[PDB]
Amino acid sequence: DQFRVGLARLARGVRERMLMGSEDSLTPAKLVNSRPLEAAIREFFSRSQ
């Protein structure tokens, strides 16, 4: 469940990068920002009750 929340945040970021960026020169590594996913996993394993 926490992984899904982080992945949804990552998808939102990728969508914003798609819309703001230029479609001519794009590769998956530039769009994907894994900071929210790591943040969600850390949040679950460190601060969940």
């Binding site: 914003e16 703001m20 590594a29 920002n33 894994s34 900071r35 009750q49």
Partner: protein
């Protein structure tokens, strides 16, 4: 409640503009500014004072310099024989056009500002700073170039939003340039991690940043970028223990030291 929907309703209660109306309003504003400077030359007074009194008379009694002096100068402007009351008329029309242009273009501000959420400023603060940038753009726009108003206004709206974020997002204020340094450092570290498959070290971040950057400087920059924590952070499952309950006072002398 929910002030966001309220503001959106007030915003949508004003119709959008077509190209004819927008170019007409921009031309009216430009001619109003020219008429203001011509009137200042004729009467010998400052352009700022005359602009302020003309704006006061346009906005009316609803918007609360004092009535005595503004009425004095407004009557002095009525003392002009001819071909100068015309300049006064174009000045007033240009100010009305400025107001209408800002009101009609308020929606672009919201559309731009909706992409800067989650960076330390609430949505309505972003909207208000975007409005300030929009007012700037109306001030500086030039319709002769046959450019749509949004094209020029977007730059100023973005500038206002970013300057506001860099100025008001942290409890401890950090200068703008060093905020940009922090953001650049974060981006560089993130790309280094993406390429490396693990968190980079300070040496690698320093190498990636470029000349004049070493591990100690990176460490200091990451040190100052720490945000303060709350003295009211709860500790434990029960709502009976806070963070500040564990922090002693070191300033006041103890009874032993006083004795």
């Amino acid at each position: 409640s929910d002030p966001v929907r309220q503001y959106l309703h007030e915003i949508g209660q004003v119709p959008l503009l077509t190209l004819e109306e927008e170019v007409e309003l921009a031309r009216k504003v430009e001619e109003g500014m020219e008429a203001i400077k011509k009137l200042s030359e004729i009467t010998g007074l400052d352009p700022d004072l005359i602009r302020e009194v003309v704006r006061a008379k346009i906005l009316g009694s609803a918007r609360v310099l004092d009535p005595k002096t503004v009425e004095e100068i407004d009557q002095k402007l009525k003392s002009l024989p001819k071909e100068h009351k015309r300049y006064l008329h174009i000045a007033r029309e240009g100010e009305a056009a400025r107001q209408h242009l800002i009101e009609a273009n308020l929606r672009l501000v919201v559309s731009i500002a909706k992409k800067y959420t989650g960076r330390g400023l609430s949505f309505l603060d972003l909207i208000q700073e975007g409005n300030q940038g929009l007012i700037r753009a109306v001030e500086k726009f030039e319709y002769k170039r046959r450019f749509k108003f949004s094209t020029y206004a977007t730059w100023w709206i973005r500038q206002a939003i970013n300057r506001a974020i860099a100025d008001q997002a942290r409890t401890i204020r950090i200068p703008v340039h060093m905020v940009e340094t922090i953001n650049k450092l974060s981006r560089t570290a993130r790309q280094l991690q993406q390429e490396l498959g693990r968190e980079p070290t300070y040496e690698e971040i320093a190498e990636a940043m470029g000349p004049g950057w070493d591990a100690k400087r990176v460490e200091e920059t990451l040190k100052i970028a720490q945000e303060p924590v709350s003295l009211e952070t709860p500790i434990g499952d029960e709502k009976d223990s806070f963070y500040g309950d564990f922090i002693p006072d070191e300033h006041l002398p103890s009874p032993v030291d006083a004795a």
